[PDB]
């Protein structure tokens with residue numbers, strides 16, 4: 343179990359750690375989050391009390407370094423940093439633990455939510471979508487745009503998601519225009535799976551990372567990416583059976599975890615109705631269809 | 643974006659454009675079978691591709707062989723149309739290729755966009771106008787060439803005959819749309835109007851009769867009467 347200590351909490355802030363959130367008051371004696379499970383990526387995220395504009399946070403894996411948070415009063419945000427002096431870090435974390443100035447990751451012994459939301463997400467891939475190589479962790483916020491969005495303006499602060507575009511030459515073989523547009527199996531399996539992602543795990547990892555950025559930061563381009571990646575599978579007549587089965591499990595926990603009151607902006611009526619009721623895979627997403635219909639029947 | 647009443651005069655500027663209509667591409671007669679079920683039999687069709695500024699018509703005849711062994715013909719027809727328009731554009735010299743292609747039905751937008759991905763600079767546009775190009779098979783010489791065709795064939799016409807010698811494209815297109823709208827509302831009356839006078843003939847190289855200017859004004863008036871009429875006869879007004 344790992345720890346992200348905080349130097350202090352100078353400004354009133356709602357802190358989020360995975361699907362968990364807590365309230366920290368201005369200058370409350372707060373020094374971090376302990377008992378973070380090893381073996382998964384994590385996201386620590388922030389919404390200031392005074393300006394709910396800009397949710398923001400950091401994707402990190404404790405196996406890759408000792409990380410802490412320190413408010414910066416100049417840039418006005420909680421910044422993640424790496425401590426290279428390991429002895430200094432252990433000493434700091436132990437003191438804060440002894441003084442019980444760290445809140446606890448409440449991981450229940452029946453709860454597999456985070457695992458099922460991050461199953462194929464890897465930090466190495468996150469760091470290639472979020473390009474900032476000098477840090478082992480990755481900053482994301484509400485306002486960052488995607489590469490594709492920038493095509494349709496700062497490239498250093500972009501989300502370099504894989505560009506998916508159904509009316510592109512990449513997506514449509516010359517001479518198979520109607521075939522390839524109505525049955526995207528070529529684009530899914532040859533262009534994307536075999537060509538770009540190399541395997542289904544990487545494809546699912548970006549999909550899951552796109553959803554989480556959509557959910558935690560309300561990042562709109564992430565939501566676009568998440569829906570495009572779903573649609574490209576649902577609109578493919580030929581998809582490996584294991585991908586379909588895993589997809590259903592993936593979407594199930596995403597729909598399960600979405601806040602009830604955010605469904606209206608995070609869920610695209612057209613893609614979901616198409617995917618669940620018109621597409622080739624309309625009958626292959628049993629779990630996902632059942633929870634969608636029992637929880638958000640309005641969108642459908 | 644969409645072509646409508648407010649940007650109507652863009653049709654007659656000097657940027658090359660084509661209207662495409664796919665209404666007559668896939669055509670069937672519906673009949674009973676010996677067992678009393680219903681079946682369709684396709685008849686020859688055509689793509690109606692028209693430069694509204696010049697009158698040039700690119701009549702691509704769709705022979706019923708193109709449907710043999712195919713499923714979902716109404717959907718295929720939209721893509722067959724897009725394949726043929728794309729081939730037409732590629733066949734033309736660069737300085738003759740259109741800058742815009744306006745489709746008369748929105749279901750052609752995606753088929754044509756995909757077939758034209760090689761031509762990113764050609765705008766594929768819908769329209770809100772209800773254009774009467776479906777009535778193009780009411781023009782005898784056009785229907786005749788479609789029905790006689792034994793293989794795929796492109797035939798080239800000027801749908802304005804020689805009108806541009808005496809009137810502007812805007813007027814030539816108003817006349818064409820009025821003739822076609824009449825032929826669509828009541829083909830028999832329309833054709834009656836157009837032929838009633840045996841001294842006014844259609845030249846071998848033309849589609850419509852050789853009316854003088856004065857005679858076109860009478861004809862045009864008679865076509866508007868017919869259109870207002872059938873509208874009453876329809877709505878009882």
Ligand SMILES: COc1ccccc1CNC(N)=O
Pocket residue numbers: 359361362363364365375445446447448
């Ligand atoms: C680390 O999660 C916490 C920290 C401090 C107080 C409460 C929680 C748990 N929140 C939650 N939503 O379950």
